[PDB]
Amino acid sequence: AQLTIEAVPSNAAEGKEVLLLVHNLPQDPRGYNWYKGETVDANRRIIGYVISNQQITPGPAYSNRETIYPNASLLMRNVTRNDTGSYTLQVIKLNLMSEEVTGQFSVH
Ligand SMILES: [Cl-]
Ligand SMILES: [Cl-]
Description:
Residues 2-108 form the Ig-like V-type domain. By secondary structure, the chain is mainly β. The protein has strands spanning 4-8, 11-12, 18-23, 31-36, 45-50, 55-58, 66-68, 74-76, 85-92, 98-107.
């Protein structure tokens, strides 16, 4: 029932790929946004997706290493030590309320 993030892997080597898999989405969300860190913070928004017109919304923290998938999951290519940390997903629900979940991974 509860929204979760699963980092695959949770500890990556430099130059490799990390997946942030999203589980237990509501039905009928309006969209998603990813943020670096622990909270919704516009200045740290990486990328989002607006479902109604399948619009990808790169944010101030966007890197061309990242791709967002329709199920909200995030693929990050060519990871570096600086990518280590927390990542927060905002799901915008049908009724325009937002729910958040925070995950993390490390790069060595
Ligand atoms: Cl962080
Ligand atoms: Cl995590």
